[PDB]
Structures are given as structure tokens and as C-alpha cells.
């Protein structure tokens, strides 16, 4: 399997970026396999 | 080798993820490459460090990204979705509350091939990578950062 990379741009803060999304606060746990899961 | 954000492709071709080239090291998420060698031009990038629990891997050298979310400011996801030009999505992160401390998290849902896209602070520094998270049906990705 041929896995390769292509440059897509600079790492830069853009002033005219689309703004969206909320900011939920969540209790989670991280297990040994790197999976987060919700916690009550 | 050049600094920038890169697509991670496989062979038609499919974009499986995204990564960050900085200080001669390529950073991406473990679940994107599983540590497999990468091709860039006529050259080959060999894995150097990887960790399944952090879901991170670095190539050619040790993890170089160390900026962190300040806990108060808006950040920007530099998303590179398959078949689309790199774009910045500004947002205010939420918080993953864990027993080992809090982690910033962004409630943004982009196609799977966007995993590994960098999250930036106002100064343009990479504070983590996008693509490991939870579902609350809405997906929320931790801001995943390594240790330099």
C-alpha cells in the first residue's frame, strides 16, 4: 500500500475564517487504547 | 521536508488523514498511518516515535509541537478535508474533563480524512491535532497535543 504526502498549505492564522461550533463541557475517560468515552 | 500542513494519501487514491511538518519532523495521528512509512517525493519518512494511547506518531525525529490552549481564547482548526482547499474554522473550544486534568475540545465535525489537521492559537502555533474524540450524535474532538 503506497502511503504518501502532498503539501496543502502554510500553517497560518486567517482573519476571515468561518466561525462556528459550540463549547460543551464533558466528563470523559481515556482508556489504554486511546479511546475516549463519556463518564457519568 | 518543507514546513506546512500535508495530506496523507493512499493507493485510485484516497485521503486518509492530515499531518504537520515542522522543524523537519512530520506529526500526525496514530490511527491515520499506524506508524507505516511515508513517501514524499523520491524520499521516505521513517517513524521515530509513536503512542497508541495519545493517538500520535512522529516521523524523522521526536515530537516538536508544544503549544497549548490558553483555556480562554478562540482557536482555529486548519482543516484539510479530502478534495478541498485548506481552510481555517475559528471556534471557542469546550473542555474534556478527565481525572488527569482538563483537555480542550472542539465541537466540529469534518470528514474522516481530515484527521491530523492542526488546531492553531492566535499566534499561529499548533496547539494540537484534530480527530480523536467522542460522540455526545454530534462529534467532539479532543485537542490532542504531544510532549516535546
Q: Where are the domains of chain B?
A: 4-59, 75-142
Q: Any idea which fold B75-142 has?
A: Thrombin, subunit H (2.40.10)
Resolution (Å) of this entry: 1.6
Sign of the CA dihedral A22, A26, A32, A35?
negative
Identify how the structure was determined. Answer: X-ray
CATH for B4-59 is 2.40.10.120
Name the residue facing B52 among A2, A14, A34 (closest C-beta): A34
User: Chain A within 8 Å of B55 (Cβ-Cβ)?
Assistant: yes
Q: Give the strand pairing for A3-9 and A18-19.
A: unpaired
- A to B CB pairs, distance under 8 Å: 158
- How far the first Cα of chain B sits from its last, in Å, is 19
Active site residue B73: no
Domain count within chain A:
1
Residue of A nearest to B42 (CA): A4
Domains B4-59 and B75-142 share a fold: yes
Q: Which domain holds residue A36?
A: 2-40
Name the residue facing A5 among B40, B86, B105 (closest C-beta): B40
Amino acid at each position: 500500500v503506497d502511503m504518501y504526502i502532498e503539501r496543502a498549505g502554510d500553517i497560518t492564522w486567517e482573519k476571515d475564517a468561518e466561525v462556528t461550533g459550540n463549547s460543551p463541557r464533558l466528563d470523559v475517560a481515556l482508556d489504554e487504547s486511546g479511546d475516549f468515552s463519556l463518564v457519568e | 521536508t518543507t514546513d506546512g500542513v500535508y495530506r496523507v494519501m493512499t493507493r485510485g487514491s484516497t485521503q486518509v488523514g492530515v499531518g504537520v511538518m515542522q522543524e523537519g519532523v512530520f506529526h500526525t495521528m496514530w490511527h491515520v498511518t499506524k506508524g507505516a512509512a511515508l513517501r514524499s517525493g523520491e524520499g521516505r519518512l521513517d517513524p521515530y516515535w509513536g503512542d497508541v494511547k495519545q493517538d500520535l506518531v512522529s516521523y524523522c525525529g521526536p515530537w516538536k509541537l508544544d503549544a497549548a490552549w490558553d483555556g480562554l481564547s478562540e482557536v482555529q482548526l486548519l482543516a484539510v478535508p479530502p478534495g478541498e482547499r485548506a481552510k481555517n474554522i475559528q471556534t471557542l473550544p469546550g473542555i474534556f474533563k478527565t481525572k488527569d486534568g482538563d483537555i480542550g475540545a472542539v465541537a466540529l465535525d469534518y470528514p474522516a480524512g481530515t484527521s491530523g489537521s492542526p488546531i492553531l492559537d492566535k499566534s499561529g502555533r499548533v496547539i494540537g491535532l484534530y480527530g480523536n474524540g467522542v460522540v455526545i450524535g454530534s462529534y467532539v474532538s479532543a485537542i490532542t497535543q504531544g510532549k516535546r
